[PDB]
């Protein structure tokens, strides 16, 4: 049911889950997402019981439960390495929680057949987990976690050992199966695709402090940091240095004039000196198919196209613009995960665009869907 946990903290003898506080309501499909090495998984371990908590509650329902070991919580946790016993058979594996719960064997066989019907394990119930591939062993693990009908369903990065062609079908399967069962869930992940497709309220986590909590589309539109901004989205948002000219800003290319409302919202706090701007790769079109009123705010003069990935419904043009000022701590720890080089910028333009590799193309930003950030305190200024 409802898992409300407040002020939860960990202290490694160092501060990995500092001040975690919210309520995972009943029915949600929460998602803990963050770079590998943050408090995204220790939080799940502490919600399960495999580690000791320091402070705060974990009251699943109406009972403070941070003082127990898990046999009295009824929370199934499917592991990553598919921790399933290699000497029992698939039927015994899927049945083990029941046979420990002291239920007569007739209902055991009935429920096990029911679950193996929910999945595609119709015939495999007579083979050890040794003669099983990745996908079917993963499904055996998930079935073992389904049967008990617990309060929470604490998934732990289960889809990490599967081929890229199978992971998408598995994500659809997991989302539909959870929407069918409906019990509370959490899910520690690693990428933004898993976190934005199967998700009801994402939770970003950097070094322990929750960066932002909201519906995935609300993390997309109005990110309230630089990490939650340049983290989600496969073509990560482009970060351009910028210096407010007190009437506008002279971005590395163009003369964007900061339409009045955002200009005054920015002038509310003229504290920093290197307030950077983020132009999402979707919001960069070309001068070819831009006919209409949108030409006046195009800011297009020309840029070279280093690499043009023509992978179908969108041409990813890479390029570079010299300068300096994309220097912070948030951006640094966001680009330590993956390489942002120095000034490599990408932009996805339409498919009808006829562009070769290594030529001069006219890219155009639209100055109505850009976000301005602060390069010292790491916090969006447009919206939050």
């Amino acid at each position: 049911a409802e898992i409300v946990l407040d002020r939860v903290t960990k202290s490694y003898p160092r501060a990995a889950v500092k001040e975690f506080s919210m309520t995972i309501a009943d029915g949600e499909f929460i998602i803990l997402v963050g770079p590998s090495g943050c408090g995204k998984s220790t939080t799940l371990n502490m919600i399960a019981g495999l580690e000791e908590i320091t402070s705060g509650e974990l009251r699943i329902g109406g009972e403070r439960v941070n003082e127990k070991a898990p046999k009295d919580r009824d929370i199934a946790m499917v592991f990553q390495s598919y921790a399933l016993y290699p000497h029992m058979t698939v039927r015994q594996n899927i049945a083990f929680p029941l046979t420990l719960a002291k239920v007569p064997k007739a209902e055991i066989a009935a429920k096990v057949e029911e679950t193996a019907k929910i999945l595609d394990l119709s015939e495999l119930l007579d083979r050890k987990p040794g003669q099983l591939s990745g996908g079917q062993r993963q499904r055996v693990a998930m079935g073992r976690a389904i049967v008990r009908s617990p309060k929470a369903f604490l998934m732990d990065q289960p889809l990490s050992n599967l081929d890229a062609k199978l992971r998408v079908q598995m994500r659809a399967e997991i989302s539909r199966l959870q929407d069918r069962l409906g019990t509370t869930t959490v899910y520690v992940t690693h990428d933004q695709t898993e976190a934005m497709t199967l998700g009801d309220r994402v939770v970003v986590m950097l070094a322990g402090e929750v960066q932002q909590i909201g519906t995935p589309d609300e993390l997309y539109s109005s990110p309230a940091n630089l990490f939650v901004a340049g983290f989600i989205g496969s073509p990560a948002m482009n970060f351009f240095p910028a210096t407010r000219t007190d009437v506008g800003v002279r971005l590395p290319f163009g003369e964007v004039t900061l339409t009045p409302h955002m200009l005054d919202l920015l002038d509310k706090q003229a504290r920093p000196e290197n307030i950077i701007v983020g132009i999402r790769p979707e919001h960069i079109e070309d001068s070819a198919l831009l006919d209409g009123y949108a030409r006046i705010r195009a800011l297009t003069f020309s840029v070279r196209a280093d690499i043009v990935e023509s992978l179908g419904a969108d041409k990813y043009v890479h390029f570079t613009t010299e300068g300096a000022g994309a220097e912070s701590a948030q951006l640094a720890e966001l680009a330590a995960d993956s390489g942002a080089g120095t000034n490599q910028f990408i932009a996805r333009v339409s498919a009808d665009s006829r562009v070769r590799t290594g030529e001069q193309i006219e890219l155009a930003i639209d100055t109505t869907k850009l976000s301005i950030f602060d390069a010292a305190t790491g916090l969006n200024l447009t919206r939050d």
């Binding site: 495999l50 592991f79 016993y85 929680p97 719960a101």
Partner: protein, 270 residues
């Protein structure tokens, strides 16, 4: 093409190389008082009376019961007291865990005659000479290195994540050791209680020195002693029959546990 023809004669040479010195004593323990070299194969007139000759009078019978008893009582205790010391691969200790696996394995290469002089002079007169309780202490001490080196190599291969998983089920910290954890280590203990037995079942110079009387005398000693007077002044058939009765159990044990034995001796090369 011809690779199979050239790589199938090696697979026959390496087997004939390892079966001829056994199919020699097997053909020698069947020639009745006509040991005339007649061959590694085709010994004509294979009428075995040697087998029912050496099994009359408690010269070899009791000297076989003694070896079986000592083997069992020194493999049970060796496994019990080596498993709990190989479980120190799951745990971790600062004051010398890296040197335990060095010392308790380097004492396996220890000249028996270097510690049979003081051990013999110590068992003498201190009520420990020709008797098992005098032969099971050195056997256990010399079998501990094997039972450690083949058990701490299987207590790594089993995943202890399964206990962490079973905990998240209704399993107590006690039911986990009866169900998930117990039957995983069983095929790894039955493979150490065979290596320890096979070792402690062929030891000369320890049952030849600490053993005089009828009791506490083993099978290898009583085979080396078939040049007395019982065998009718030609102890070839009798010695070969003793050797064959002794090398039957090793063959039966290797025909069945080849895979586990190799995986244990190599420690991860199955």
């Amino acid at each position: 093409a011809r690779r199979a023809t050239w790589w199938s004669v090696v697979n026959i040479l390496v087997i004939v190389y390892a079966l001829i010195p056994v199919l020699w004593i097997l053909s020698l323990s069947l020639k009745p008082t006509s040991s005339v070299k007649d061959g590694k194969l085709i010994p004509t007139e294979i009428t075995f009376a040697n087998y029912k000759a050496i099994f009359s009078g408690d010269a070899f019978t009791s000297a076989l019961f003694n070896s079986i008893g000592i083997g069992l009582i020194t493999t049970i205790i060796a496994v019990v007291i080596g498993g709990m010391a190989a479980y120190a691969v799951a745990r971790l200790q600062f004051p010398g865990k890296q040197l335990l696996i060095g010392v308790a394995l380097l004492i396996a290469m220890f000249p028996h005659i270097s510690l049979v002089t003081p051990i013999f002079n110590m068992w003498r007169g201190i009520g420990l000479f020709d008797t098992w309780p005098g032969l099971i202490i050195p056997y256990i001490t010399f079998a501990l290195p094997l039972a450690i080196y083949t058990l701490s190599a299987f207590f790594r291969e089993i995943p202890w994540d399964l206990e962490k998983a079973a905990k998240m089920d209704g399993a107590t910290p006690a039911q986990a050791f009866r169900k998930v954890i117990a039957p995983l280590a069983a095929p790894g203990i039955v493979t150490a209680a065979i290596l320890v037995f096979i070792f402690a079942w062929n030891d000369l110079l320890l049952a030849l020195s600490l053993t005089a009387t009828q009791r506490a005398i083993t099978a290898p000693v009583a085979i080396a002693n078939f040049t007395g007077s019982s065998q009718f002044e030609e102890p070839t058939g009798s010695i070969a029959a003793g050797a064959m009765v002794i090398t039957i159990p090793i063959i039966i044990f290797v025909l069945i546990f080849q895979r586990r034995i190799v995986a244990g001796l190599t420690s991860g090369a199955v």
